[PDB]
Amino acid sequence: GPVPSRARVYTDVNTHRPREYWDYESHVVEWGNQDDYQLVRKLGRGKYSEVFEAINITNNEKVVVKILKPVKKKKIKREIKILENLRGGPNIITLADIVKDPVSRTPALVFEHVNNTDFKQLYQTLTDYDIRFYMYEILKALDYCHSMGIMHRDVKPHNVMIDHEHRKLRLIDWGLAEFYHPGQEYNVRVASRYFKGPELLVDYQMYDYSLDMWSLGCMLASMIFRKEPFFHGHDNYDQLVRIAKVLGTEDLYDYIDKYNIELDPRFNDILGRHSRKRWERFVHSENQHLVSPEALDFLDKLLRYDHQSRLTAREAMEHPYFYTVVKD
Numbered sequence: 001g002p003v004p005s006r007a008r009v010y011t012d013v014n015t016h017r018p019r020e021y022w023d024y025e026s027h028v029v030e031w032g033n034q035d036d037y038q039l040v041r042k043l044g045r046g047k048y049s050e051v052f053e054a055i056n057i058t059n060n061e062k063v064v065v066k067i068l069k070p071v072k073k074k075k076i077k078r079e080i081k082i083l084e085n086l087r088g089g090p091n092i093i094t095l096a097d098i099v100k101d102p103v104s105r106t107p108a109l110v111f112e113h114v115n116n117t118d119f120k121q122l123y124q125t126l127t128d129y130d131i132r133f134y135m136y137e138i139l140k141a142l143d144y145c146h147s148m149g150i151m152h153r154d155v156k157p158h159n160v161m162i163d164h165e166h167r168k169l170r171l172i173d174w175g176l177a178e179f180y181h182p183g184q185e186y187n188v189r190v191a192s193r194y195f196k197g198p199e200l201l202v203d204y205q206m207y208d209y210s211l212d213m214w215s216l217g218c219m220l221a222s223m224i225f226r227k228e229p230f231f232h233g234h235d236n237y238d239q240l241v242r243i244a245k246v247l248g249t250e251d252l253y254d255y256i257d258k259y260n261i262e263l264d265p266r267f268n269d270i271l272g273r274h275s276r277k278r279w280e281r282f283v284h285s286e287n288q289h290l291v292s293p294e295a296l297d298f299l300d301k302l303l304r305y306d307h308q309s310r311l312t313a314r315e316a317m318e319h320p321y322f323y324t325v326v327k328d
C-alpha cells in the first residue's frame with residue numbers, strides 16, 4: 001500500500017487539546033437574534049451557500065451574512081467550530097454571530113464586513129512591495145490556523161479579501177477547512193482545480209497543512225509572473241500535466257515512488273517526458289518589475305511535489321523575500 005505521512009510541524013496539537021476543541025459533531029451552536037440583521041444586497045452564491053451584505057441594526061454597522069445551503073450538520077458544525085476556534089487570530093475573518101434564517105431554515109453566519117478592493121483591480125495594480133507585504137499577511141493567517149490544528153484546504157485569490165485602503169487582509173471561506181489528525185486519510189476533492197496540490201492530483205489522502213503552502217505558491221506564481229491562474233489545467237488530469245511541464249516528470253516519479261503511490265493509468269497517454277524548468281523562463285519585460293532572485297527562490301521552495309519538502313508557513317516568514325517588508 002501507500003507509505004504513511006505526517007506533518008513535520010504542529011503534528012500533535014489536536015491530541016493535546018481537549019476533545020471539545022476538534023470533536024465538532026458534538027458542538028452546541030449558540031444562536032444570536034436573527035432580527036438584528038437586515039439583508040441589503042446579494043453578493044454571490046456558491047454550491048453550499050448564498051452570501052449577502054447586511055446591516056446590524058443594533059449598531060448600524062455593515063456585516064456579511066452567509067446563509068448555508070442545506071448540507072449535512074457535521075459540515076455546518078465543522079465550519080462553525082473552526083471559525084470559533086480561530087476567532088481573533090491574525091488576519092482570520094471574524095465570525096460575529098450565528099442566527100437561524102427563517103426562510104432557508106438553515107444557519108446564517110454573520111461576519112465582520114471587509115470593504116475589499118476589486119480583485120481584478122488588485123491583480124492589475126499590486127506592486128512588488130505590495131505582493132511581499134500581503135504574502136506576509138497571508139502567512140500570518142496560515143501559520144496561525146496550522147498552529148491551531150487546522151488546514152484551510154481552499155487557499156485561492158477569491159478567499160483572500162483585501163481592503164487595500166487600510167492594507168487589511170482577511171482569509172475567508174473556512175467551509176472546506178479541517179482538523180489535522182496524524183494518520184487520518186482525507187478527501188482529495190478539495191481546493192479549486194488550479195490550486196490543488198500534487199498530493200490531491202495523485203490521490204494521496206494522508207496529507208496535511210503543507211497542502212495550503214502549494215496553493216499559496218500557485219498564487220505567488222500568478223502574481224509575480226502575471227499569469228492567472230499559473231497552472232491552467234482543463235481538468236484534474238491535465239492539471240497535473242501542466243505542473244509536470246514545469247517541475248518535470250522525473251521528480252514527479254520520485255514523489256510517487258517515495259510514497260509507494262501509483263499514477264492513474266490514464267496518464268500513460270498524456271503525461272509525456274518533461275525536464276524541470278528554470279523559473280527565469282517565465283520572466284519577461286511585462287513582469288520583471290515583480291521578479292527578484294529572492295522571489296524566485298521563495299517560489300521554488302513552496303512549489304515542491306513532495307508535500308514534506310515545502311516550506312512551512314513559519315519557515316516561509318523567515319525568507320529573505322520578506323526582508324524589505326516593514327515589520328510592525
Ligand SMILES: COc1cc(/C=C2\SC(=O)NC2=O)ccc1O
Pocket residue numbers: 043046049051064066093111112113114115116161172173174
Ligand atoms: C464577500 O464579502 C465578505 C465575505 C466574507 C466571508 C465569507 S464569504 C463565503 O462564502 N465564506 C466566508 O467566510 C466576510 C466578509 C466579507 O466582506
